[PDB]
């Protein structure tokens, strides 16, 4: 049906140096509609965290060395240069919206 | 696309009665589930929510006001139509889909 | 509650001539990111989407249709109304909200 | 803000033996408004894998073993009897919904 392909799957990252994470989907594209992705890292003795949130925006609180771009069904999440504290497991995540479709109306009305 | 079909298109209804509209849709509709609301539209204000999700009332909506249905196909009935629900009234539908994951990437240090 | 005021009530345009609609909310606003859609019924027909998430068209939606805003205020601008564009215009706040996620829990087998 | 407990954050079971996992979630009732939960099951070698939608529906293809339960801010995973193939990380995920709220609309005359 949709299929999202996250490369790679592995980063052996030397702190300084930049780093960069790619998603990709299969969605049939047609009228989903719209697709988002957003980027969480889990590391251990945390929840998950949001760090990029509809391709391009930051939570609160990241530090600035995230940041993401793309465009379609590819899209990146790229730190300009890793620290010790980044490791984890990064996961990328597709929401896809539909607009909602409405009805013609019924009027109401009383004696 | 996809295209709703709400009935009918106007009521005139006698108070203390009973009424009742009907919407059904037209959604690769199986990794899709839709969801049915309804908003009233009375004079001078605002659309508000009244039915969410083919079943649930907004607050504040009187217990006069239900919904069923299944699928595509949904209805809500006033029981007893009173003067303060004179309005337009609207069915929309929402498509949800579950949010899919990519596989890990494990960040180490080397 | 949240209250949407969309301004003016009624437009009569001159073909030709450029139309402009503006929409504002009053929406604990920090955990909130509002977004604006702007749908249209024409006569005769549902309602339709026009501009999604403030800025963009919807499919088949001419150029002439555009938006801007930011926050809370949004704006729809018409450049050239065409007799094609006669219609009920709507804005719609959706309010998202990133998905908060627990701890682990492994499973594992003794 | 919203915080998520999820209880325990580990399951030691027995195959034949039932397990259940719990999700609380602190959300100052108002008016989000409606608050859905998700479970998830993340294995080595799959993408994570979806198990109970909207706090009650199973997706296809995931054993009957899996149900769920709840109401409010309280929902619970079960699984009637473990099978070995079942170890694995187990997330709960909220979503808070908000109704939509509109204007009161415009309409556009020509002369």
């Known amino acids: 049906?949709?299929?999202?392909?996250?490369?790679?799957?592995?980063?052996?990252?030397?702190?300084?140096?930049?780093?960069?994470?790619?998603?990709?989907?299969?969605?049939?594209?047609?009228?989903?509609?719209?697709?988002?992705?957003?980027?969480?890292?889990?590391?251990?003795?945390?929840?998950?965290?949001?760090?990029?949130?509809?391709?391009?925006?930051?939570?609160?609180?990241?530090?600035?060395?995230?940041?993401?771009?793309?465009?379609?069904?590819?899209?990146?999440?790229?730190?300009?240069?890793?620290?010790?504290?980044?490791?984890?497991?990064?996961?990328?995540?597709?929401?896809?919206?539909?607009?909602?479709?409405?009805?013609?109306?019924?009027?109401?009305?009383?004696? | 696309?996809?295209?709703?079909?709400?009935?009918?298109?106007?009521?005139?209804?006698?108070?203390?009665?009973?009424?009742?509209?009907?919407?059904?849709?037209?959604?690769?509709?199986?990794?899709?589930?839709?969801?049915?609301?309804?908003?009233?539209?009375?004079?001078?204000?605002?659309?508000?929510?009244?039915?969410?999700?083919?079943?649930?009332?907004?607050?504040?909506?009187?217990?006069?006001?239900?919904?069923?249905?299944?699928?595509?196909?949904?209805?809500?009935?006033?029981?007893?139509?009173?003067?303060?629900?004179?309005?337009?009234?609207?069915?929309?539908?929402?498509?949800?889909?579950?949010?899919?994951?990519?596989?890990?990437?494990?960040?180490?240090?080397? | 509650?949240?209250?949407?005021?969309?301004?003016?009530?009624?437009?009569?345009?001159?073909?030709?001539?450029?139309?402009?609609?503006?929409?504002?909310?009053?929406?604990?606003?920090?955990?909130?990111?509002?977004?604006?859609?702007?749908?249209?019924?024409?006569?005769?027909?549902?309602?339709?989407?026009?501009?999604?998430?403030?800025?963009?068209?919807?499919?088949?939606?001419?150029?002439?249709?555009?938006?801007?805003?930011?926050?809370?205020?949004?704006?729809?601008?018409?450049?050239?109304?065409?007799?094609?564009?006669?219609?009920?215009?709507?804005?719609?706040?959706?309010?998202?909200?990133?998905?908060?996620?627990?701890?682990?829990?492994?499973?594992?087998?003794? | 803000?919203?915080?998520?407990?999820?209880?325990?954050?580990?399951?030691?079971?027995?195959?034949?033996?039932?397990?259940?996992?719990?999700?609380?979630?602190?959300?100052?009732?108002?008016?989000?408004?409606?608050?859905?939960?998700?479970?998830?099951?993340?294995?080595?070698?799959?993408?994570?894998?979806?198990?109970?939608?909207?706090?009650?529906?199973?997706?296809?293809?995931?054993?009957?073993?899996?149900?769920?339960?709840?109401?409010?801010?309280?929902?619970?995973?079960?699984?009637?009897?473990?099978?070995?193939?079942?170890?694995?990380?187990?997330?709960?995920?909220?979503?808070?919904?908000?109704?939509?709220?509109?204007?009161?609309?415009?309409?556009?005359?020509?002369?």
């Open positions: 929309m539908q929402r498509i949800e889909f579950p949010l899919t």
């Open positions: 909207r706090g009650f």
């Open positions: 959300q100052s009732l108002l008016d989000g408004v409606n608050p859905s």
């Open positions: 959604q690769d509709s199986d990794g899709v589930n839709p969801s």
